[PDB]
Design a protein around this ligand. Structure first.
Ligand SMILES: Nc1nc2c(ncn2[C@@H]2O[C@H](COP(=O)(O)OP(=O)(O)NP(=O)(O)O)[C@@H](O)[C@H]2O)c(=O)[nH]1
Ligand SMILES: Nc1nc2c(ncn2[C@@H]2O[C@H](COP(=O)(O)OP(=O)(O)NP(=O)(O)O)[C@@H](O)[C@H]2O)c(=O)[nH]1
Ligand SMILES: C=CC(=O)Nc1ccc(S(=O)(=O)N2CCCC2)cc1
Ligand SMILES: C=CC(=O)Nc1ccc(S(=O)(=O)N2CCCC2)cc1
Ligand SMILES: C=CC(=O)Nc1ccc(S(=O)(=O)N2CCCC2)cc1
Ligand SMILES: C=CC(=O)Nc1ccc(S(=O)(=O)N2CCCC2)cc1
Ligand SMILES: [Mg+2]
Ligand SMILES: [Mg+2]
Lengths: 214, 212
């Protein structure tokens, strides 16, 4: 085929997402209790869109519909602040904005622009794709270079854990990578939900314990 | 209707701009970062107007903006009270976002309204269609700004080209009144009204931060 273009259809979609965002930002000006935003990212096809659809809906579409650059979801949830002592304090009402980024190079500039709005990052690779794993180092570098906090809260997800017959990333290699950076690691599946909320609650716990210092 | 994606040279340029921007914000985290954004049709003079403001120079060669860029200036802003009552000189560190105008970049440029505390709308005094597009630009600003009722200054640029002037002054002033936005006819060649227009936008941002 010819080199795929920017369509009218697709630029409209991206501007619809931007309309929505500007609306949501203006809403929470007029002042559930907290607005926490984080951003999901990784090689295309590793499952970032599937991961968040699982977590907000509990469903999973098998058909690959690659992302048009940028999109986001929301979820009202209750956070519980912890401590060594199981303090598990009084639940604070939290209103999440889960950003979703296209992994394809042609969206690199546009997605990277939304790191300003992120408070923490959900980095994904595909347990069935060794290249996406080796690319994790570069994604992390982009995060330190382009995020708006230094050494920003990352939580790393090896996804498609439900495809064992096709895994190729050794669990030890990922544990080691994430240990080398001090980054929490979960193997997840967007199809059956395994570790989806655990990984996100983890990210939210990282972002929440950060603000509580200042 | 065949918009190419960004080449890797374009992609490279915009990423070095965003690195510049992230570093700037991070140093700011460590004495008001005041941000606004230039916008308008392509060829109306956004890059030139900002370069006249920061560096006092002007380039005749058209070099269209690869998507997004910004400039900086350090300025001293003093408030207005009664009888003048010009207050203490506050230090303002202005980030000035510069956007491509060609609709091919429209999805990327609009990603940066979130950072803009105000807008500098430009049309060309010598291009009527650039002035007629203003309305669509303002609705774009209403629909996409990250605070509602955004602060805007309007600039009919290229005022040094009297012989080429086609936009009537009545149509412009009438339009600025309909929307309650201040209007300046400017020139990025000789600096006329550039400073006055930018400082005015900075007063509206300052005065509006002071109401909270
Ligand atoms: N078996 C299985 N398939 C999965 C899993 N997660 C995603 N997939 C499949 O992998 C493909 C890619 O999923 P998708 O969520 O669109 O990936 P993406 O990270 O958003 N790619 P892009 O950045 O291009 O938008 C889809 O066909 C999806 O059904 C998983 O946990 N298990
Ligand atoms: N005489 C005169 N020429 C001007 C003035 N402002 C810009 N120009 C010229 O008209 C062209 C506009 O250039 P530029 O400032 O890049 O316009 P732009 O608004 O940034 N367009 P783009 O969105 O493509 O970046 C250039 O040739 C520039 O030299 C002005 O006030 N007077
Ligand atoms: C990269 C780490 C990080 O935490 N980034 C971030 C934090 C907060 C916000 S904000 O939306 O809450 N905002 C309004 C008030 C001032 C700042 C946006 C991005
Ligand atoms: C990489 C993310 C991750 O997974 N962990 C992690 C990394 C850095 C920090 S930091 O916030 O403590 N740092 C910079 C601000 C003050 C000191 C905290 C957690
Ligand atoms: C006078 C009106 C006015 O200034 N509104 C306005 C102010 C600040 C910003 S911001 O983007 O720079 N901000 C949030 C994120 C970090 C800092 C945006 C719009
Ligand atoms: C200069 C262009 C422009 O749009 N300026 C401007 C916009 C809004 C406000 S306002 O929000 O503070 N206002 C209206 C409602 C009550 C008080 C003030 C100035
Ligand atoms: Mg996707
Ligand atoms: Mg320009």
């Amino acid at each position: 085929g010819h080199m795929s273009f920017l369509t009218e259809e697709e630029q409209e979609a991206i501007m619809k997402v931007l309309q929505r965002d500007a609306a949501l930002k203006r809403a929470e000006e007029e002042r559930y209790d907290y607005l926490i935003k984080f951003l999901a990212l990784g090689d295309s096809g590793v499952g970032k869109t599937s991961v968040l659809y699982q977590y907000t809906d509990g469903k999973f579409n098998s058909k690959f519909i690659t992302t048009v650059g940028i999109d986001f979801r929301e979820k009202r949830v209750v956070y519980r602040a912890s401590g060594p002592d199981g303090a598990t304090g009084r639940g604070q009402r939290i209103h999440l904005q889960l950003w979703d980024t296209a992994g394809l190079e042609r969206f690199r500039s546009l997605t990277t622009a939304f790191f300003r709005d992120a408070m923490g990052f959900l980095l994904l690779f595909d347990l069935t794709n060794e290249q996406s794993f080796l690319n994790v180092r570069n994604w992390i570098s982009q995060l330190q270079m382009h995020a708006y906090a230094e050494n920003p809260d990352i939580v790393l997800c090896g996804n498609k854990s439900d495809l064992e017959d096709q895994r190729v990333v050794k669990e030890e290699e990922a544990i080691a990578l994430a240990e080398k950076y001090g980054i929490p690691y979960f193997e997840t599946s967007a199809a059956n939900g395994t570790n989806i909320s655990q990984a996100i609650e983890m990210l939210l716990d990282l972002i929440m314990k950060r603000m509580e210092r200042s």
